[PDB]
C-alpha cells in the first residue's frame, strides 16, 4: 500500500492539484526522466512533444509524470507548456516522485518509464521505442 496517489501535484499553470485525480490516465502512464532543460540535450524533445501532441489530440490515453532535477519551477513549467507532457508534474518536492525513480530502480537517465494505469508493468525503457515507432508506438506502450 504505497504510491504517489494522495500527493498534490502542480499544474503548468503554476497551479496545484491532486495528482490523484489530475493523474487522470485511468489507462496508461508514462514517467520521464531527463531534467535535460537545464543542461543541453535538444532534439529528442520535439519528438515527445509530437508523440504525445498527436496521442493528446486524440485524448492520449495516457499521462506523462514530470521528473528529473526540474527543480526549476520556470524550466518546469516552460518545458510542460513548449510541448512536453500533456498533464502534471510531480513537484521535485514529492518524494514519491523520488522514492518512485528509485523504486523503479531508474537513475538510467536519460529514460523513459512506461506503466499501466492500474500499475501494470508494459515497457521500461522503451524510449528509442517510441521515438522509433512514434505515435504509433502506443501499442508497445500499451501492448
Known sequence: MEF????????KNRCEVNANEALKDKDIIGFYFSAH????????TP?????????????????????????SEDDMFQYMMESHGDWLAIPYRSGPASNVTAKYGITGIPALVIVK??????????????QSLGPRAFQNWAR
Open 47 to 71: 519528438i515527445l512533444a509530437d508523440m504525445y501532441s498527436e496521442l493528446v489530440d486524440d485524448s492520449a490515453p495516457f499521462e506523462i509524470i514530470f521528473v528529473s532535477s526540474d527543480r
Open 117 to 130: 494505469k492500474d500499475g501494470t508493468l508494459i515497457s521500461m525503457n522503451g524510449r528509442g521505442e517510441v
Open 37 to 44: 532543460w537545464c543542461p543541453p540535450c535538444r532534439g529528442f
Open 4 to 11: 504517489i496517489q494522495g500527493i498534490k501535484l502542480v499544474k
